[PDB]
Amino acid sequence: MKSVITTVVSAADAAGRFPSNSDLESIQGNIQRSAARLEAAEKLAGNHEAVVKEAGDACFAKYAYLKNPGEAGENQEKINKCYRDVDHYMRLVNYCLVVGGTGPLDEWGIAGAREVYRTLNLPTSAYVASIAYTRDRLCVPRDMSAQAGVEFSAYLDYLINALS
Amino acid sequence: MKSVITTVVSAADAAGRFPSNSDLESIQGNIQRSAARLEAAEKLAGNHEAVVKEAGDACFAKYAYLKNPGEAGENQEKINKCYRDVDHYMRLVNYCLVVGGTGPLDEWGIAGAREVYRTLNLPTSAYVASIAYTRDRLCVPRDMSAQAGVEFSAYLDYLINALS
Amino acid sequence: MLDAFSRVVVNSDAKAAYVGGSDLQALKSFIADGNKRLDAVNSIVSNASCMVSDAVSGMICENPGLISPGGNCYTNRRMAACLRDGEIILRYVSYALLAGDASVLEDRCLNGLKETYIALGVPTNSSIRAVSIMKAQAVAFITNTATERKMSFAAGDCTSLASEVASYFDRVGAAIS
Amino acid sequence: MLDAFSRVVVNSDAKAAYVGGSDLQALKSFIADGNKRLDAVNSIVSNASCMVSDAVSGMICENPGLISPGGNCYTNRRMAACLRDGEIILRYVSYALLAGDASVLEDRCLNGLKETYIALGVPTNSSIRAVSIMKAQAVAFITNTATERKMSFAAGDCTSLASEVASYFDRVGAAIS
Amino acid sequence: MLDAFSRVVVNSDAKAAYVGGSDLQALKSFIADGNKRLDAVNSIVSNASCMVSDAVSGMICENPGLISPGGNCYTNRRMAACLRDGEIILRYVSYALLAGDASVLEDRCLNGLKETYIALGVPTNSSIRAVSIMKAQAVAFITNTATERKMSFAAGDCTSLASEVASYFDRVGAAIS
Amino acid sequence: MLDAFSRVVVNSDAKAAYVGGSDLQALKSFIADGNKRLDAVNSIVSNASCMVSDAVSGMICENPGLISPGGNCYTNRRMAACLRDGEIILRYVSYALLAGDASVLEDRCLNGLKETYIALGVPTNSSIRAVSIMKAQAVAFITNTATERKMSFAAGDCTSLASEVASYFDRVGAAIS
Amino acid sequence: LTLPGTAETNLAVPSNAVRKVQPYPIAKPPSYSSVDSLRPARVSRMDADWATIYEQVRRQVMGNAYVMEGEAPDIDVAFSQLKGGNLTVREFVRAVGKSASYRTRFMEAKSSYNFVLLNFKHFLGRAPTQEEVSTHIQILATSGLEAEIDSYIDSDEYKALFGDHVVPYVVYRGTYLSSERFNRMVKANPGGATSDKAKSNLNMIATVAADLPTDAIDVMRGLPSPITSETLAFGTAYYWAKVEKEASEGRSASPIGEKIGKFDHAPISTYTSLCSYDKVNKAPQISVTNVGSDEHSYVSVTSKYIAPDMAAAAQMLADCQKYKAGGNAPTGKWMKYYPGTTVNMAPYISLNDTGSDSSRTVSVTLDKVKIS
Numbered sequence A, B: 001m002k003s004v005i006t007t008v009v010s011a012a013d014a015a016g017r018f019p020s021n022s023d024l025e026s027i028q029g030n031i032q033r034s035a036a037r038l039e040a041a042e043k044l045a046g047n048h049e050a051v052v053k054e055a056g057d058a059c060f061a062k063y064a065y066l067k068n069p070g071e072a073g074e075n076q077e078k079i080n081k082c083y084r085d086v087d088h089y090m091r092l093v094n095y096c097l098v099v100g101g102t103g104p105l106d107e108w109g110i111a112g113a114r115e116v117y118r119t120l121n122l123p124t125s126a127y128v129a130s131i132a133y134t135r136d137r138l139c140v141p142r143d144m145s146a147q148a149g150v151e152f153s154a155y156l157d158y159l160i161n162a163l164s
Numbered sequence C, D, E, F: 001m002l003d004a005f006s007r008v009v010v011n012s013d014a015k016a017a018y019v020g021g022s023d024l025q026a027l028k029s030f031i032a033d034g035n036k037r038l039d040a041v042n043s044i045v046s047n048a049s050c051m052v053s054d055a056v057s058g059m060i061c062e063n064p065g066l067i068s069p070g071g072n073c074y075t076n077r078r079m080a081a082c083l084r085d086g087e088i089i090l091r092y093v094s095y096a097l098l099a100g101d102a103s104v105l106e107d108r109c110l111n112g113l114k115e116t117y118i119a120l121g122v123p124t125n126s127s128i129r130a131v132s133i134m135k136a137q138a139v140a141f142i143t144n145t146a147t148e149r150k151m152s153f154a155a156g157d158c159t160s161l162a163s164e165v166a167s168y169f170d171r172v173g174a175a176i177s
Numbered sequence G: 001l002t003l004p005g006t007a008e009t010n011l012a013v014p015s016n017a018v019r020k021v022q023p024y025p026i027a028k029p030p031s032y033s034s035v036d037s038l039r040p041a042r043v044s045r046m047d048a049d050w051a052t053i054y055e056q057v058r059r060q061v062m063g064n065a066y067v068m069e070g071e072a073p074d075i076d077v078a079f080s081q082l083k084g085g086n087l088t089v090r091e092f093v094r095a096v097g098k099s100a101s102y103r104t105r106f107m108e109a110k111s112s113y114n115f116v117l118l119n120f121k122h123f124l125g126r127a128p129t130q131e132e133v134s135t136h137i138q139i140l141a142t143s144g145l146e147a148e149i150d151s152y153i154d155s156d157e158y159k160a161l162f163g164d165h166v167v168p169y170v171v172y173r174g175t176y177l178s179s180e181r182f183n184r185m186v187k188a189n190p191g192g193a194t195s196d197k198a199k200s201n202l203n204m205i206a207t208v209a210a211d212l213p214t215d216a217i218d219v220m221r222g223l224p225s226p227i228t229s230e231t232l233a234f235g236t237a238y239y240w241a242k243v244e245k246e247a248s249e250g251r252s253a254s255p256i257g258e259k260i261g262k263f264d265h266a267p268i269s270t271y272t273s274l275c276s277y278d279k280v281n282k283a284p285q286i287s288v289t290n291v292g293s294d295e296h297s298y299v300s301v302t303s304k305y306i307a308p309d310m311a312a313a314a315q316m317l318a319d320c321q322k323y324k325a326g327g328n329a330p331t332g333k334w335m336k337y338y339p340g341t342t343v344n345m346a347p348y349i350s351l352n353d354t355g356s357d358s359s360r361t362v363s364v365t366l367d368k369v370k371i372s
């Protein structure tokens, strides 16, 4: 969806013209950038079960209230719904590292979050605590390259900034 | 004008949003392309009086009928008007080699060409005889680098396709 | 809409699957002909005005039944429409050569092109002959076998993109047949 | 458009009849439960946000094919639409309960709902389940048989209005089937 | 891979049939003279729209009573049907040049076509002259001895393919008469 | 088969027939030296379009009165009709070469040619001069002694068929003497 | 953003630099118009509050967009100036249309022809003719998006119907410039619970507004007409014609069959040897490329291709009016049915075995690239 290609192709079509030499110049950056973010994708896809397990419970460690009855986490299965609720978010930032833009995150995870998390009483401050626990746990020598840790963190705080 | 920066900063503004990771990535292409085209601008600015003297006369070598009386070339001074009337185009190819897009070529040279060249009886085929004579004389060992001559030819034929 | 990067996510969205190292190298292969694709679109829009004017007049010069009165390309307005009508096809195939897949022109240009040309009364067999000239010259430029215009390039193979644009131009022809 | 007082005038416009004392007492009975209808509309819009959010999640919790990818309530935007799509159904049956006849929703809500959901790909059997939860809950409020929320009323009969709103919730179901 | 081509042409459950890169030389090793036989069909189907518009107009300019009142190419319901029918013969004969067998041509195209044309009142005097132009039009394109268009090829002899379509057009002339 | 070839000619309607390869070897066994004779017809009719366009052009350069105004080849209605009689001599002598007889040449073509040329004002002394060029053209093609187009052949002698066609061409000229 | 009082921007006409803002909203059009008395009242800037001006701009200009709260901040930019009086509601829908939220659900997702028809539906509230399309499709070719939305808002048709203070709506004016232009407007504007987003092809007004005849179908106009103006005719009489249309208007059943493209085929008993009427007019759709070794050749079977009925009007009607002095001489009493026609040997080329010759008689006429 909203990639760097669909940015320049729709803008060249809304002007009603051919792909000019600015638009061919915009795709030349993607050779210099896909070598860093696509190995961040397979480091996410090869470790996606761990980063939902030991980081999804850190919201419950910070917010230990919501396992009380009458509230948003009642029984064991809604916690299993909650680890399903955050696995789609880690799928989508994997889905935006492979695109290069912020395209698959907006209409699939972001657009409509102010509606469904208000009616179903889901606290967005407990969402962003689990995501920012993943954000500050990046480092150069263990996780990925020194350059991929910039852009993997640059998609996560956009999820923080759009949910808050 | 229509640069690679002002394409992606107006499309971010017409959406009404921040510069995302798709918009930051498009400027990373300018690190890899400004070494190629800014050398071509210094080859054009250091040789601009040569490429209108022994290339502006080649339209008159192709069209000797224009110097007939009652035509668009009457006296000595309209030919001296004409070499100024071609040097403004070669200033504009220089004005878009340093931008990166077709920004200053459009509203300063193209937008309105179908009006003033039809009403004042100027043949646009004798424009593009002079411009495409400069196009086929590019080569790698004498003129510039191998990559600058691709892009300098890529702005000349855009002027051919606009006037024809 | 869907580029070559976002084509492999909507195949993976229906599986709810993370994109991993089994098909990322197929996508990393696409980036390896990045500059090979990039010069190819530049060679298309280089001679784009001379592309369509040789294509429509070649369709006229083999079938001179439209210039006859009562023909579709008879008057001076409809030839200005027809030079514009083949120019949009060149404009949107060049988007699909840049996006890497036939997804931008499919829902914008081809979606409803069939009954637009039927209701206005465009001879659909002559529209096949119109874009088949634009198919055979699009592979003539990006393999650089054009006789009257030769462009300098870095040497190598580019025939993988030649099957790409030739798979787009008969998708236009199948959408209008 | 048409309320309950204006429904009998177009029944009398087809006969060119002065509306008189043979059916004014059928309409005076409508004003006799004037306050009974008036408290009934207020109980629907009292817990109106908890009405639709329990109803669409009850449709989800019996059929998790929509949360599966490829389902019509998979992504986040479609759950935001489906929370709002069933809210408009509550917004117009609360109009028709106030107006006393199914005329205000039959042309503003039902006229055109079938082909919008067909061309979107909305599963019509699931929206049947979605509004029949709202049928079972709207009669649970105006009979004051809601287990988690009891409201105080003047005591009496209200089951004539219970079949009234239940007749409306099968009118939205018939136009989508 | 030709069994994949032979169904799809007898209209089984596939929509289309695509031949890859490695399969294309596997098809070329299967049939004999695989480089020339793909060049012969590429000469035919690039000029199919010009050939049937010339052969129908060649049929009219021999016998001009078809566009007289009482003819068969009067009332352009019929004239667009005859312009359709010339293309269907050309599209089936170009497959038979590609496959090398006339077996698809006899069972899909030609059985009962003598019975169809006597039931429709199609005159067999002019319908043979429609085919006999298209035999001479196809045999001039194959050896590149067309008057107007000279297409570029790798040089050599193609007269074994040129007498192949004259056998295939004679089976159309046998099954119509 | 030859009686079936007789059913092609005499039916007074357009008809067409071919012979398959199982039926072909019976035809080569029934006729004598038939691989020469099937090469004999194929030498002529592959160059028949230049043969009549040079012989009746050679009739004009020996007798320029036919392009005088009022002359019989002045208008293009008459000029195309002179080539139409030129080819129809050449097909009917080729089937007479193919069947090996002259009875189809007399009964289908030459019975009634003197009665229709005097009634049409056709110059019989000039058309004998036209067909004697076609006698002289065909003996160069049957002995491969044409100076422009020489054809490949399985070598040997075919001067018996050189005298066979010159016995067919003078039977045309004695019929219009 | 510009000024707290701004009647017109962009200086297109010269007389807008001196033009005031309208002090009051414009009146209704002065014809009779029997339909609009059943219609709801029009919403203006100076009668209604911002809760319902935003809803009716979403209900008409946005079609039925379902804009969320985080969706469309460009509209929230443009709405925040309209509440401050910084631009009129005429200029506000210019800012809505030029924004990307209008682009990313109507311009990129719909087709090129359908984008013009939705612009007449949203901005002017009607449906165009073919000449109105043909002047608007060149602005999408030469000038782009921003100049094409300027052709609606700076037109005189907008300023007479709505002016500077009235939200766009379906204006029933009774006496129209064409009888088509009433009922093509009505077909383009259905009532509630309809959007534009599912019909990525609209495909029905894209072929009624394409050719200037073939006005659209009556049940496609009795559907969105108002009430006590449709009833006693939509109980069960045209009601099944409405439901069978709605399953065709939904999912976009393409009207090659019944609307335009109107071919009397032969009955199925007439051929019966070229049988199986599913497979009756199918040809091999063959394509070759022949480039290197990634170069496919994809013989698809094509669909039932129809006689196009206009290429058979170019052919056989414009030309082939050969048609002259066909007396052809008439001596030939011996020709006996055919006269001019050669035996036509035509040897199928002797590839040394299993290849054979057949012959066929035909009438022969010399061509026009022949003698002299």
Ligand SMILES: C=CC1=C(C)[C@@H](Cc2[nH]c(/C=C3N=C(/C=C4\NC(=O)[C@H](C)[C@H]4CC)C(C)=C\3CCC(=O)O)c(CCC(=O)O)c2C)NC1=O
Pocket: A043, A044, A047, A050, A051, A054, A136, A137, A138, A139, A140, A141, A142, A143
């Ligand atoms: C793709 C994202 C991604 C991650 C962030 C980690 C997340 C992560 N970190 C640790 C485990 C750890 N993580 C760190 C943190 C660091 N270690 C260092 O050498 C750096 C200084 C610093 C990088 C921020 C340390 C010190 C431990 C061991 C102690 C602990 O468990 O906290 C563990 C448990 C044991 C293990 O699996 O290694 C996990 C799942 N894994 C992932 O797949």
Ligand SMILES: C=CC1=C(C)[C@@H](Cc2[nH]c(/C=C3N=C(/C=C4\NC(=O)[C@H](C)[C@H]4CC)C(C)=C\3CCC(=O)O)c(CCC(=O)O)c2C)NC1=O
Pocket: B043, B044, B047, B048, B050, B051, B054, B136, B137, B138, B139, B140, B141, B142, B143
């Ligand atoms: C900014 C762009 C730019 C140019 C392209 C040249 C254009 C140019 N070339 C030549 C002059 C020439 N140009 C060429 C052409 C070539 N020479 C080679 O080594 C290559 C094989 C081939 C490149 C296509 C030759 C062979 C001459 C000398 C003969 C002649 O004058 O034509 C001249 C006249 C004399 C001179 O100054 O050299 C000019 C103005 N100058 C410029 O300022």
Ligand SMILES: C=CC1=C(C)[C@@H](Cc2[nH]c(/C=C3N=C(/C=C4\NC(=O)[C@H](C)[C@H]4CC)C(C)=C\3CCC(=O)O)c(CCC(=O)O)c2C)NC1=O
Pocket: A021, A024, A025, A028, B033, B147, B151, C032, C033, C034, C035, C036, C037, C038, C039, C040, C042, C141, C142, C143, C144, C153, C154, C155, C156, C157, C158, C161
């Ligand atoms: C802004 C303008 C602009 C462009 C349009 C592109 C064009 C471009 N192409 C190549 C480089 C190349 N480009 C081609 C492509 C082709 N060669 C042919 O003979 C075919 C005709 C054609 C394929 C269709 C090939 C084969 C190479 C060398 C291999 C490669 O790098 O891909 C390179 C150098 C890459 C390198 O070697 O490191 C550049 C910079 N770049 C730009 O800066």
Ligand SMILES: C=CC1=C(C)[C@@H](Cc2[nH]c(/C=C3N=C(/C=C4\NC(=O)[C@H](C)[C@H]4CC)C(C)=C\3CCC(=O)O)c(CCC(=O)O)c2C)NC1=O
Pocket: C047, C050, C051, C054, C055, C057, C058, C059, C061, C062, C132, C133, C136, C137, C140, C141, C145, C146, C147, C148, C149, E046, E148, E149
């Ligand atoms: C009866 C009139 C008549 C015409 C008008 C032309 C039109 C024409 N050109 C080409 C064929 C072509 N046309 C071009 C186009 C061009 N070549 C250039 O150098 C320019 C950049 C550009 C025209 C300005 C190219 C590159 C080819 C391929 C062959 C070639 O390289 O010349 C073809 C063949 C298409 C095909 O093979 O499918 C036709 C019909 N030919 C005709 O017979």
Ligand SMILES: C=CC1=C(C)[C@@H](Cc2[nH]c(/C=C3N=C(/C=C4\NC(=O)[C@H](C)[C@H]4CC)C(C)=C\3CCC(=O)O)c(CCC(=O)O)c2C)NC1=O
Pocket: D032, D033, D034, D035, D036, D037, D038, D039, D040, D042, D141, D142, D143, D144, D153, D154, D155, D156, D157, D158, D161
């Ligand atoms: C603006 C706020 C506002 C309202 C919402 C209505 C509500 C209202 N209801 C009743 C009065 C009543 N209301 C009900 C209705 C009900 N009782 C039940 O047990 C059912 C749950 C429910 C029907 C759905 C009944 C049964 C009476 C008593 C009989 C009657 O007066 O109708 C009365 C007093 C009339 C009287 O007794 O004289 C009023 C003022 N009026 C208002 O001013």
Ligand SMILES: C=CC1=C(C)[C@@H](Cc2[nH]c(/C=C3N=C(/C=C4\NC(=O)[C@H](C)[C@H]4CC)C(C)=C\3CCC(=O)O)c(CCC(=O)O)c2C)NC1=O
Pocket: E056, E066, E072, E073, E077, E078, E079, E081, E082, E083, E085, E086, E088, E089, E108, E109, E113, E116, E120, E122, E123, E126, E127, E130, G264, G265, G266, G271, G274, G280, G281, G282
């Ligand atoms: C499987 C292979 C296949 C074919 C060969 C054609 C055969 C064919 N032709 C027609 C139908 C027709 N075919 C012709 C054709 C002609 N009349 C003439 O004078 C000319 C000689 C000739 C055109 C060159 C006409 C005129 C009709 C219409 C008959 C009528 O409407 O009166 C029909 C009837 C069905 C319909 O048209 O809807 C069929 C099956 N279609 C096929 O599917």
Ligand SMILES: C=CC1=C(C)[C@@H](Cc2[nH]c(/C=C3N=C(/C=C4\NC(=O)[C@H](C)[C@H]4CC)C(C)=C\3CCC(=O)O)c(CCC(=O)O)c2C)NC1=O
Pocket: F068, F069, F070, F071, F072, F123
């Ligand atoms: C001043 C007095 C006078 C004349 C002498 C004639 C002269 C004459 N004869 C013919 C014209 C002709 N002349 C002949 C005659 C002959 N061609 C033959 O092959 C025969 C051997 C020979 C006669 C014996 C024929 C066949 C024509 C053409 C018929 C025609 O023009 O209608 C024409 C051409 C007329 C035209 O162009 O239509 C003229 C001027 N006319 C005159 O007004």
Ligand SMILES: C=CC1=C(C)[C@@H](Cc2[nH]c(/C=C3N=C(/C=C4\NC(=O)[C@H](C)[C@H]4CC)C(C)=C\3CCC(=O)O)c(CCC(=O)O)c2C)NC1=O
Pocket: F047, F050, F051, F053, F054, F055, F057, F058, F060, F061, F062, F132, F133, F134, F136, F137, F140, F141, F145, F146, F147, F148, F149
């Ligand atoms: C006044 C103008 C004028 C002409 C038009 C020609 C007409 C002409 N052609 C040939 C003679 C011929 N004409 C052809 C025919 C052809 N050769 C080919 O290779 C092609 C396939 C085909 C059309 C060009 C052949 C094969 C011969 C025999 C050549 C020979 O005699 O060696 C002859 C001699 C035969 C005879 O006299 O009976 C004459 C008069 N000569 C002229 O003086």
Ligand SMILES: C=CC1=C(C)[C@@H](Cc2[nH]c(/C=C3N=C(/C=C4\NC(=O)[C@H](C)[C@H]4CC)C(C)=C\3CCC(=O)O)c(CCC(=O)O)c2C)NC1=O
Pocket: F033, F034, F035, F036, F037, F038, F039, F040, F042, F142, F143, F144, F153, F154, F155, F156, F157, F158, F161, G347, G348, G349, G350, G351, G352, G353, G355, G356, G357
């Ligand atoms: C299916 C269609 C069909 C044909 C087109 C012919 C083609 C043909 N001709 C001959 C074969 C021949 N053709 C000729 C004839 C001639 N040779 C010359 O050099 C003279 C110019 C010319 C005299 C007219 C001769 C002399 C032979 C060899 C003897 C014979 O087989 O008759 C052969 C046998 C070649 C071999 O097997 O080696 C074939 C296939 N026969 C057919 O069945």
Ligand SMILES: C=CC1=C(C)[C@@H](Cc2[nH]c(/C=C3N=C(/C=C4\NC(=O)[C@H](C)[C@H]4CC)C(C)=C\3CCC(=O)O)c(CCC(=O)O)c2C)NC1=O
Pocket: G001, G077, G078, G079, G080, G081, G082, G083, G084, G085, G086
């Ligand atoms: C495109 C550029 C663009 C902008 C820069 C802003 C500018 C802007 N702000 C407001 C409108 C406003 N802006 C403010 C803001 C403030 N007042 C304070 O006391 C604080 C100092 C400050 C916030 C930090 C307030 C409070 C209003 C509403 C005024 C009111 O009605 O009370 C309005 C009028 C529209 C409206 O009222 O909603 C506009 C155009 N909007 C734009 O569209």
Ligand SMILES: C=CC1=C(C)[C@@H](Cc2[nH]c(/C=C3N=C(/C=C4\NC(=O)[C@H](C)[C@H]4CC)C(C)=C\3CCC(=O)O)c(CCC(=O)O)c2C)NC1=O
Pocket: C056, C066, C072, C073, C078, C079, C081, C082, C083, C084, C085, C086, C088, C089, C108, C109, C113, C116, C120, C122, C123, C126, C127, C130, G111, G112, G113, G133, G134, G137
């Ligand atoms: C948004 C995407 C988009 C497209 C895909 C094209 C498609 C298209 N073509 C035409 C319209 C037309 N297109 C043609 C074209 C042709 N007729 C022929 O005989 C030739 C085969 C062929 C030229 C190659 C003609 C002649 C008309 C005008 C018909 C007329 O009014 O006479 C129209 C109607 C608008 C108009 O009439 O100007 C549209 C939408 N245009 C677009 O804007």
Ligand SMILES: C=CC1=C(C)[C@@H](Cc2[nH]c(/C=C3N=C(/C=C4\NC(=O)[C@H](C)[C@H]4CC)C(C)=C\3CCC(=O)O)c(CCC(=O)O)c2C)NC1=O
Pocket: E024, E033, E034, E035, E036, E038, E039, E040, E042, E142, E143, E144, E153, E154, E155, E156, E157, E158, E161, G288, G289, G290, G291, G295, G296, G297
């Ligand atoms: C992907 C699709 C595809 C095709 C379209 C063909 C295209 C094709 N043809 C030939 C190659 C050839 N093509 C011809 C054909 C002809 N030459 C003539 O002079 C006649 C006019 C014409 C007869 C029809 C000949 C003679 C050769 C050389 C090989 C041979 O002699 O058989 C070659 C190999 C060499 C070359 O590149 O030219 C290819 C790739 N093959 C394919 O794979």
Ligand SMILES: C=CC1=C(C)[C@@H](Cc2[nH]c(/C=C3N=C(/C=C4\NC(=O)[C@H](C)[C@H]4CC)C(C)=C\3CCC(=O)O)c(CCC(=O)O)c2C)NC1=O
Pocket: F056, F066, F072, F073, F077, F078, F079, F081, F082, F083, F084, F085, F086, F088, F089, F108, F109, F113, F116, F120, F122, F123, F126, F127, F130, G327, G328, G329, G330, G331, G332, G335, G338, G339, G340, G341
């Ligand atoms: C069955 C076998 C068969 C034939 C042999 C021909 C015989 C023949 N020729 C013509 C008809 C004709 N034939 C000629 C021919 C000639 N005049 C000359 O000056 C030259 C000597 C010679 C050409 C070389 C001309 C010019 C006409 C037309 C006469 C006219 O239009 O008035 C006609 C009248 C019918 C018509 O053409 O409309 C017939 C039956 N046709 C046949 O179907």
Ligand SMILES: C=CC1=C(C)[C@@H](Cc2[nH]c(/C=C3N=C(/C=C4\NC(=O)[C@H](C)[C@H]4CC)C(C)=C\3CCC(=O)O)c(CCC(=O)O)c2C)NC1=O
Pocket: C062, C063, E047, E050, E051, E054, E055, E057, E058, E061, E062, E132, E133, E136, E137, E140, E141, E145, E146, E147, E148, E149, G365, G366, G367, G368, G369
């Ligand atoms: C009075 C009515 C009348 C006509 C309508 C034409 C019709 C016509 N065309 C051709 C003959 C032909 N027609 C074509 C077809 C084409 N040629 C091209 O260059 C295009 C690409 C393509 C569409 C026009 C070809 C290739 C030939 C054979 C060689 C040639 O004549 O060009 C033939 C000869 C067939 C034969 O000899 O059996 C005829 C009769 N001629 C007539 O006499």
